[PDB]
């Protein structure tokens, strides 16, 4: 039986940069919500866009005071009693800032933690939500953190730098943390105690990976645009290559992230053409 290519289902954006409520400008991250809504860190509009409703809406006003956003890069939905959103952006000191917003966009608090003001600085290369509602971060030093935003507290952290060249995305499923390695063309897999388990993929299968997610059955999906077409490569939970899907309808480059929706639709963000793309289930 034949297997289909990737096919576009829906979009947010116009394939060109803009400042209007239907457009993005150099967007740098996104997340799924508990509904069909998708939130986008719309970097050069200094806002988070919420798409999904007939009329999109936005979180934040531009700036560096509490509740304002400045070059937001990542947005993470934390599952719990109610959904809350972490936004990572640039603070007034030019360094990483983390803020918490509630489900309808109101500012809650700035996340102030020792882990966010280290001497060495913190540049976040990947962020996701853990299954239990924690914020999962990977930094450019190779440190991996799981953060309870309420205490706030680092509940666990470890050093991935022996194996990890450069993180581009991260996902957690069960007790395992999967990090796409943009430098080594593979996925690095760890336990939450920091034990390295295995790598998945290789240059011939997962070149320059930019996104990862894990399906409800534990299959690992890894996205790249090497050669200027989106590819989604599927691995079994043990790392066996299953199938590589290609998007042939049009060219894409400089994509960021990957998420599987509950319905199976596949989501990535194209920074190059300022557009979020949703594809039919694989
Ligand atoms: Mg304009
Ligand atoms: Mg225009
Ligand atoms: Mg992902």
UniProtKB/TrEMBL annotation:
Signal peptide region: none
Binding-site residues, Mg(2+): 169, 212, 258
Protein name (Swiss-Prot/TrEMBL): B box-type domain-containing protein
Species of origin: Caenorhabditis elegans
Gene name of the record: nhl-2
Coverage span on the entire protein: 729 to 1009 of 1032
């Amino acid at each position: 039986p034949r297997v289909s290519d990737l096919k576009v289902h829906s979009v947010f954006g116009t394939s060109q940069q803009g400042s209007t409520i239907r457009e993005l400008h150099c967007p740098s991250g996104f997340c799924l919500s508990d509904t069909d809504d998708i939130l986008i860190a719309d970097t050069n509009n200094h806002r988070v866009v919420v798409c999904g409703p007939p009329h999109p809406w936005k979180i934040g006003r531009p700036g560096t005071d509490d509740g304002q956003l400045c070059f937001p890069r990542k947005v993470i939905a934390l599952r719990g009693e109610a959904v809350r959103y972490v936004v990572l952006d640039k603070g007034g000191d030019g360094k990483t800032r983390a803020q918490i917003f509630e489900a309808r966009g109101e500012f809650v608090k700035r996340l102030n933690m020792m882990a966010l003001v280290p001497r060495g600085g913190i540049e976040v290369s990947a962020a996701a939500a853990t299954p239990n509602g924690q914020l999962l971060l990977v930094d450019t030093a190779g440190f991996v953190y799981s953060i309870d935003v309420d205490a706030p507290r680092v509940t666990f952290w470890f050093d991935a730098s022996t194996q990890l060249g450069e993180a581009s995305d991260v996902a957690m499923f069960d007790n395992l943390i999967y990090i796409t390695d943009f430098k080594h063309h593979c996925v690095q897999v760890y336990t939450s105690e920091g034990k390295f388990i295995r790598k998945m993929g290789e240059p011939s299968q997962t070149p320059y990976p930019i996104g990862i997610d894990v399906s409800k059955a534990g299959e690992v999906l890894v996205a790249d645009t090497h050669g200027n077409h989106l590819h989604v490569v599927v691995f079994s939970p043990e790392g066996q290559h299953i199938h590589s899907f290609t998007h042939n309808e049009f060219r894409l480059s400089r994509c960021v992230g990957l998420r599987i929706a509950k319905s199976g639709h596949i989501v990535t963000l194209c920074k190059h053409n300022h557009t979020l793309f949703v594809f039919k289930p694989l």
